[PDB]
Symmetry: D2
Subunit: 287 residues, 4 copies
């Protein structure tokens, strides 16, 4: 019953997998996990980027890059086989990979309703379709693929906490003001619900499910939005970014992932972690 931070929150010997682990939020996660004792497979579509981050960003050489398309049912099969070969188990799957939606439907006070349909109808049917394959379908099959590996990590018992899958949702799953496209938000709402359904099914089998629901974070997606923020009256930053007056950072993400992956988070299943800076309390939502 040692309550020291270094004992509670370390992830020594934890074997983790992070899709989208080489940029933005996913990167801040693997940097937190590896610096504090873990072996973190990062899975991306760009073999570079995965490489550059495996070297350079590791502090102990425990970022193992592993190229794959987390939405492709067959790339998952080859990625699982490899990790079954090289390691035999994992303890933590983090479904963080994500795309931005179709272009947002712009509604400027000087847009007629006739113009806003022009926008609405232009949206391409194959995009708004794909965001759903990455965010929802892709999460489902990621779980289906690693479930033996996750079941094995419970048997090896290298960590006292249960095997666990974390899913990067969005506060867009609750924010009712379409700041992106209705498809990003709708897919995040869909994956957030599926996550609660999986915790309902599979916690009894010893695989806990949790959702991290981020506000505004500097990633490759938000690169431009973050640049734009520098041009906002305080009262706007406070409503579009955070009333605490900043977007999130490495340490914020480090706290979340380290809390839920360690023994501290060993009894958490079905939690939606809202790390938003307080933004959700300021926009119309359903949280």
């Amino acid at each position: 019953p040692s309550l020291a931070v270094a004992d509670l929150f370390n992830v020594n010997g934890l074997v983790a997998v992070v899709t989208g682990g080489a940029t933005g939020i996913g990167l801040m996660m693997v940097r937190a996990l590896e610096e504090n004792g873990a072996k973190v497979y990062i899975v991306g579509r760009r073999k570079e980027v995965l490489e550059k981050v495996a070297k350079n960003e590791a502090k102990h050489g425990n970022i193992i890059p592993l190229q794959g398309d987390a939405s492709s049912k067959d790339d998952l099969e080859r990625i699982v086989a490899h990790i079954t070969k090289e390691t035999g188990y994992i303890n933590l799957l983090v479904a963080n990979a994500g795309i931005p939606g179709p272009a947002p439907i712009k509604m400027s006070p000087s847009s007629s309703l006739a113009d806003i349909q022009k926008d609405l109808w232009n949206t391409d049917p194959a995009e708004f379709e794909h965001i759903f394959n990455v965010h929802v379908r892709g999460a489902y099959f990621s779980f289906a693929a690693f479930l033996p590996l996750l079941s094995a990590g419970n048997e090896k018992g290298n960590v006292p906490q249960s095997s666990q899958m974390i899913i990067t949702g969005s506060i867009g799953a609750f924010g009712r003001v379409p700041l992106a496209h209705y498809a990003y938000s709708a897919s995040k709402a869909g994956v957030t619900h599926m996550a609660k359904q999986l915790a309902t099914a599979f916690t009894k089998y010893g695989i806990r499910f949790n959702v991290i629901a981020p506000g505004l974070y500097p990633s490759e997606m938000t690169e431009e939005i973050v640049k734009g923020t520098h041009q906002l009256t305080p009262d706007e930053y406070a409503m579009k970014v955070s009333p605490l007056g900043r977007p999130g950072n490495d340490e914020d993400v480090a706290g979340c992932i380290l809390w839920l992956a360690s023994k501290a988070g060993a009894w958490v299943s079905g939690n939606v972690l809202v790390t938003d800076g307080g933004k959700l309390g300021l926009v119309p939502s359903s949280y």
Copy 2:
């Protein structure tokens, strides 16, 4: 300020469109709407069924059958053009079309976890992908297609209530026990959220959005589940069907659609109508 039921709840002169209007729930809607004064275009993929129901089921000959694929962006364009030709406006779009998901992942107490992945991984990637095109993408483009027609119904002013789009969700959007496949539920959660986002955007433009969230109803999907119910201890019917001891019926659906489409419902936007017989209160949910 006449408060008589016949004055409040009539839909005389209302021009409505109901996808999936020729079977199950959608049928009970168009029968309620047409019997009480409306012109109801029913849109389906089977030209028959739409026909059989246009004759036979109408009581005033105001069911106009109109074949189309409500998910196909191009069939919507031809359906809109036709209704713009023949009528010029609509007052009410009802996105009721729906498919059942992939086969549910069965979890029988005598299934090992090794077996339940076998199930989970078998799910086809093109199905769990399509339910999302019908339920979410298909709803979006249905709104995008009829938005001029809905904007016109506000101008013709044949009814005092605003133009309105209703979307048939599901209590599966909140039920956390996967009674179907995680994709049905996840798509319904996604469309339910998009509906709240559209009410947030477009009520100010005079198009109200509402969701009907049905429990167990005798349709073509539930045909078998309803047969199976006859074999349940009361305490099971009460938890899998309704603690009131029956599934829903024509009059239940008639009440919902007639309430939200008439002047009675003229001030409702953003409501999720849960017509479930009380089931949701008995299963793990997030409502």
Copy 3:
């Protein structure tokens, strides 16, 4: 019979109903629609002279029976139930609509320092607080506890095909995260809304359905002033403080809700939160 006709579906002929706060504001619009469309409606208030006017003047068939009582007082409920258990023997529908406004709201004007806003916060009286909760939550609980035999009897007399039912007037303040009243009002409505979902979970299996009506802005005795104030609002503020449809609610809106849920149309509804808000909730920070 499968009559999908408005006059057959939505009539409340022979329905015996009880409406607390039934003589002003929202509660009045409910009794006027229930009685006009065939019901016998007991209205329960404390101001007996207000009940008598409504019962004589607002009825169209003389079926508003005024009956003075304090719906929060456990002992007034006991005497009210008895009168009905004698004069009538059963009810089909209990409507817990009685409500008070909270303590004074905490003013947060852009030119208030945080030092000033505590001055406000701390001034709130502990009894106005502890009191809004007795009317809205405790008062609803005991109203249900008192009428439960009468509600169980209405299932036996079977004068209506729908189950016996209790409706509770909550608020969109149960989900709205910007307090337009005191944190006590909103917190009590959130509390009663949840208790209502818990009662539908318990008691639908025994044939008493529970539902919540969650109103936006409605002209009542509580909102009178706020409604007067609305007349000085840019369209854009009005669309956000009131409704993007450009009006507050009215008799017919309330008539639709209560007539839908009390009739055979609503006979299969239990655990629904009916949000009749004009779309406001979609515009303010909420948790709906």
Copy 4:
């Protein structure tokens, strides 16, 4: 500095905290982790002798300062704030953890008639009701109103990089729709949970973040009996009344939550409901 190291991220060195109910059960596990990891922790209870034991015996650095008071009493709060305003001058973290169990729960056994279940329902005492709401909701409000200067001061002293913060111990009973306690307990927790979201909406812009910890089953003074009872449960009932992970919570679980939200790790969290339930909520009817 961007030290992504557990000892740098999650330490609470120099944090000045206040924990109501900090001498038993959950509140104790919080102070033991805050103090062991570097904080000065005022514990506020009514039983002064229980505060003194914990402060002498459970500290590892002698930084548990016992301080008797009634967290629901508006006037005891006034005297507590003053002591701290003199002895210390600021706080960084207020934890409203004090709580009571409700009235006796309404027993609904399969062999209870509905006539019997009203007997139960109506027996509930109007004061036990009106009282659970004063501790859980009213008591939380005035605790915030009292410490708001002290919380505003901790932002100025800047002994920690994170904002001043108030945490509120809610319950998964705020979402669980099957009442395992009285409808009053659940309804008060739902009410305080909502007020907490409303306060984060108001006061994060002024630099006081609000968050809710929502516990499942934890061994405290309130749950002692229930925990004893669990030892006679088929695995399947235990998985549903307790947790599908097969245990109730413990010191380390609570330590993780409070240390995550009070440290620099949690410095950007406002409006989060932390559900630490072992997965129970996913198994019972809920509204989360």
